[PDB]
Design a protein around this ligand. Structure first.
Ligand SMILES: Cc1ncc(C[n+]2csc(CCOP(=O)(O)OP(=O)(O)O)c2C)c(N)n1
Ligand SMILES: Cc1ncc(C[n+]2csc(CCOP(=O)(O)OP(=O)(O)O)c2C)c(N)n1
Ligand SMILES: O=P(O)(O)OC[C@H]1O[C@@H](O)[C@H](O)[C@@H]1O
Ligand SMILES: O=P(O)(O)OC[C@H]1O[C@@H](O)[C@H](O)[C@@H]1O
Ligand SMILES: [Br-]
Ligand SMILES: [Br-]
Ligand SMILES: [Br-]
Ligand SMILES: [Br-]
Ligand SMILES: [Ca+2]
Ligand SMILES: [Ca+2]
Lengths: 671, 666
């Protein structure tokens, strides 16, 4: 007898309930509820190769309800990915390939890192947009190389989160019809029956976004779910399949209950569940016929083999394009990257312009685009204000007459910071593009956890933020960042650049673009003075903090270091001659990135900030951050309150960003 | 004077004030001028003379960039906002900042500017009115009855927070909330249809809202009729007002340039001509003042309510005194002693429990003395431990509009909408609200925490699961940078208590403090610490000496929350190595920073070196330990493993404390 769908689904049940029991921790409800959905999608529709999780044209799957991780670990194991049974035995254990929520980079087949509800859905919107752009860009009438679907499992949690609204409204407007969402519709969240706090007509909601909805599907009928996916694959709109399930389905006593979401079933309940399901095998034992029914290694090999032959036929007709496709899918920059980056930094230096760093950024974007065809910019409805767009770009737009998008390389995201940012994580994960997205610095508070997840996954998302201080002027304290620059530096693995002029901007951008981890690039509204640099100083900008103005040789005056960033570098420099007329010799250290500076070696950090010489930090943001560089004995010229609505000039004088206050602070520090 | 003249007065003030400041947003106020007339002039119940009248309708400007609209309305209808202040739009110390600010201007109910949050505040205000009515009203005497109006645009509707707020408001059947949508087809990048093609009426019906689609947004009578229909509604209402951004402008109306830039003098002169507005900038003729002014109607309205309240007091003296107490945000009478008893109880019990359980234990005690206490959780009630045995769940009525009364709210998975709704509840008066979620997901709600801090209102945000100590859920949940990142927000108190006693102090301080608070609790059990009565009295100073030097080489160990235990366990082993350790517990560094210099010097004397110990990023501690001190923390994301395994793996051990201390004293 070969395996029935019931036996295939019950294997998921058994692995889930057993792994959770073993760890005494985790979530058996969702995996047990979603088991028939897993069979229908994975065994009948998903195009993938377990032997090569990196195959360019694989379907992308995302588990947005990430707490149900054992569902993904079961499917991966059963269908033949390199995730052995011993790894499932070590669910939720230190250094296992089975962490409590799935982690990209940790486990083969895991496309993104989930756990924070709602972000998977948005990642998946990004992945579908990437497929759609990459298809419009690379496919030719006589040779197709891009064609895959994007699948996402999600629950009540993701649908309640505001980010689902941002993502799905945008996906509906852009007609991303190869995105197919399967909703685990089980009527229950952690607090109990969802109807008491979440009574949406969800089908009607998604129709309003311009999605196709298949409501009221029996989530325990494989054939019905299978049929719903097949209809979805014929749809001219993104689809939502509402799969009515019972949470913890199959459990003897606890199914549909308020206690199966996120605690182990208990040994008795498992024993009773085994008998109720007729599942006779011991924990982590899977019978041969169950592996044989699930295993995807043969079909995965045929699929990738046909694709490789298709790509070979495409290379013969389109060799330059085929090589571009490979390079870009790998996330590799051009072979002559070092030359091309240097041309961009050098042009910034030749021009010697005094402009706002948001304008510097746009000038640098212009130069990047000319050599990076993968460049993909965008803004959360602040295009003309962030200056994220370039003259030769083309805006992404839905096709007027059918599904999908016309190719473009700049995206209007709408007023959707968080959705934009998690979409960018998706775009970066998909491969083929180098994406970035802008908003005002303070509204990093809206997209924050997406910046964090990018930093956790270690993918090189680029987040542009403009209007970075009181320097923005009249829009006032709701808009003026104070705490943000420092608060972003706190996130592990997230580089923060706050350049002082065109040259630092070109370095920040070129560095960010080549770096493996994500970056925040922070620009001013207001014009900042250009700084002339020697060759030695130019070479040191990329070290994050460097000596911009040194003391003269063999001097006699009392020494101070001024450490400044961004718009405050200008203030530090205007303070040098005045400090000298006061008997104080001021070195100016510019620190466009403290994160990068901290990675420099000890000899170099000691050369920039010599022990025993006192320091004043200068930055239009909270002061406490600076104590790591200035100590208890040092000073800081900064801002520890919210701002005020007035012109920038007025605000800078009001808040003590003046030569006089710098002098006074330096004198206090030297006393 | 005609309604056209009334509307154009808003146009003139808005375009002229933006020109004078050479800065601001004339588009929206010009586009919404008739909507302003219909609501403010024909439906809004309010007394310009007393902005704090308890039973006033609440108005929220969610599309806060259109601030000149509100300043105009406030000025025309007779609030204490003189023409001189409109002349000083966007200037230092004016009562007319670029986005409206609660506390700065009379009649400004909340601070907006961050899109979407106004809408969520209004959901909170309407929930406040509804709960208070169900609680205080009686069959023979009504004292609570008012509507909540919110102006909003495309930005607010795109923001995910609008989904959170409106989905919750629909399920709770808050039928007195009335939202007027400035439906103008434009956002900053241009034609919204290219990035925002939602059928918004259909979306809102899906939430359980009543929708009045396709209203002519320049026809006062039609908008008026829609507002009237909405006041008759079973459900919250969205009135979709079709408008032209910059409407009335001579040549630029409906353009992509009127959102956020001055019209220019040329355009203004021509607009004066096309409108037939003959008066010079900031000059309003007396007939327009006479048509707009609401002083007399406002006085009759509040006088009628004042009488109904007196009729209520004669029948319900005790309930009436409670109403006045709570609307004013005043604590109960023997408050100092009741709070002292709650602390003393935690001290007497001496239990070792998680601070999440401590928190629940304190909530039990707070609830017994604060009938105004209003808890809730973002779908983590049994995990945050935000409810208490006697609490009752807020629920929609089964059969009609509105809610049954309750004092714990299930917010669903909506950290940001919950938090901004809590701000609204606080601003409304009548309750002492709080809401919980996991600490890391403060990232979702972050900007609402910030706005509570800007408005200086005492919102309470509960966060549990505060570090690697949460264990198996792993690095997406395990907070690392959060504690320090919340300390950086100005005016936001952050408490991270070590045990039941610190928890009791943190909670009682938060309840009586004017600024908002983050209360941060552990998932795992934390050891109880015995305190002298003098140590007890210093807990509310935010940092204090928990274990003093024995009257060997001196060090100070500064520790917070769950790490106080590791600091205390290190004292004896450090003694065996010739180091005399003082332990300073710092449950709130923010509160500590506010103490006077003598006290701070007493706790942290100059010249004694310091090691900080906290399960979070290490750099923050340099403000206290200096370049020469040490930190025992975590500067990477965590891992998925049991808590005990994590603490060992990440160096939270006595050995590491000793080693750091010796490095520091070298
Ligand atoms: C942003 C965020 N907030 C809160 C949580 C904690 N949490 C995890 S699952 C969940 C409930 C969502 O339940 P649902 O998605 O309906 O999953 P089911 O229990 O039905 O599997 C919550 C509140 C989280 N993981 N992420
Ligand atoms: C959270 C947030 N993100 C971004 C912005 C910047 N911003 C202000 S108004 C606006 C456009 C909103 O357009 P709409 O609400 O339709 O305004 P209209 O110009 O039509 O009044 C944007 C993107 C903001 N104020 N708040
Ligand atoms: O002049 P910038 O700062 O680019 O824009 C100023 C204002 O104009 C609008 O675009 C934005 O809403 C912002 O508030
Ligand atoms: O066991 P605690 O930490 O209370 O919470 C249980 C966990 O499992 C679920 O209930 C929650 O999502 C949380 O992740
Ligand atoms: Br067996
Ligand atoms: Br060009
Ligand atoms: Br457009
Ligand atoms: Br000593
Ligand atoms: Ca559910
Ligand atoms: Ca608009």
């Amino acid at each position: 007898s070969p395996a029935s769908t019931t036996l295939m689904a019950n294997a998921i049940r058994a692995l889930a309930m057993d792994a959770v029991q073993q760890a005494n921790s985790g979530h058996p409800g969702m995996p047990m509820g979603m088991a028939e959905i897993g069979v229908a999608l994975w065994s009948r529709h998903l195009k993938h190769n377990p032997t090569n999780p990196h195959w360019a044209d694989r379907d992308r799957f995302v588990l947005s309800n990430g707490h149900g991780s054992m569902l993904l670990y079961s499917l991966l194991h059963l269908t033949g990915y390199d995730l052995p049974i011993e790894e499932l035995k070590n669910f939720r254990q230190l250094h296992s390939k089975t962490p409590g929520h799935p982690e990209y980079g940790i486990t083969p087949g895991v496309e993104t890192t989930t756990g924070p509800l709602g972000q998977g859905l948005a990642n998946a919107v990004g992945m579908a947009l990437g497929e759609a752009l990459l298809a419009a860009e690379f496919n030719r009438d006589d040779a197709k190389i891009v064609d895959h679907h994007t699948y996402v499992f999600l629950g009540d949690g993701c649908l309640m989160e505001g980010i689902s609204h941002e993502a799905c409204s945008l996906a509906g407007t852009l007609k991303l019809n190869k995105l197919i969402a399967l909703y685990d519709d089980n009527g229950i969240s952690i607090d109990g029956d969802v109807v008491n706090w979440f009574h949406d007509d969800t089908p009607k909601r998604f129709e309003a976004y311009g999605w196709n909805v298949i409501p009221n599907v029996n989530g325990h009928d494989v054939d019905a779910i299978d049929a719903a996916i097949a209809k979805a694959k014929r749809s001219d709109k993104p689809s939502l399949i509402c799969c009515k399930t019972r949470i913890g389905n199959g459990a003897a006593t606890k199914a549909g209950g308020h206690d199966v979401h996120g605690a182990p079933l208990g040994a008795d309940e498992i024993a009773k569940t085994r008998e109720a399901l007729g599942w006779t095998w011991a924990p982590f034992v899977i019978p041969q016929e169950v592996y044989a029914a699930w295993d995807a290694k043969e079909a995965g090999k045929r699929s990738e083999d046909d694709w490789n032959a298709a790509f070979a036929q495409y290379r013969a007709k389109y060799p330059a394009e085929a090589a571009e496709f490979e390079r870009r899918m790998a996330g590799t920059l051009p072979a002559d990257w070092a030359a091309k980056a240097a041309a961009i930094v050098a042009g910034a230096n030749e021009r010697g312009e005094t402009v706002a760093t948001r304008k510097a950024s746009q000038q640098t974007i212009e130069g990047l685009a000319a050599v990076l065809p993968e460049l993909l910019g965008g803004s959360a409805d602040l295009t003309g204000s962030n200056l994220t767009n370039w003259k030769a770009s083309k805006a992404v737009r839905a096709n007027a007459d059918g599904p999908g998008v016309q190719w473009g390389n700049h995206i209007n995201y709408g007023v959707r910071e968080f959705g934009m940012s998690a979409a960018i994580n998706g775009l970066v994960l998909h491969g083929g593009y180098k994406p970035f997205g802008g908003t005002f610095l303070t509204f990093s508070d809206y997209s924050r956890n997406a910046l964090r997840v990018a930093a956790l996954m270690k993918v090189p998302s680029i987040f542009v933020f403009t209007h970075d201080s009181i320097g923005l002027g009249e829009d006032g304290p709701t808009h003026q960042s104070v705490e943000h620059v420092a608060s972003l530096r706190l996130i592990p693995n997230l580089d923060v650049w706050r350049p002082a002029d065109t040259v630092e901007t070109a370095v920040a951008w070129t560095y960010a673009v080549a770096h493996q981890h994500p970056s925040c690039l922070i620009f001013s509204r207001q014009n900042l003075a250009f700084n002339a640099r020697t060759d030695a100083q130019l070479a040191n900008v990329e070290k994050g903090g460097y000596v911009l103005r040194d003391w003269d040789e063999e001097i006699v005056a009392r020494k101070i270091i001024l450490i400044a960033t961004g718009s405050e570098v200008e203030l530090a420099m205007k303070a040098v001659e005045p400090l000298a007329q006061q008997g104080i010799a001021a070195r100016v250290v510019s620190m466009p990135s403290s994160d990068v500076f901290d990675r420099q070696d000890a000899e170099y950090r000691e050369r920039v900030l010599p022990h025993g010489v006192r320091r004043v930090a200068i930055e239009a943001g909270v002061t406490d951050f600076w104590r790591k560089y200035v100590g208890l004995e040092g000073g800081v010229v900064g801002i520890d309150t919210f701002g005020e609505s007035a012109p920038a000039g007025v605000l800078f004088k009001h808040f003590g960003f003046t030569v006089e206050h710098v002098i006074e602070t330096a004198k206090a520090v030297l006393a």
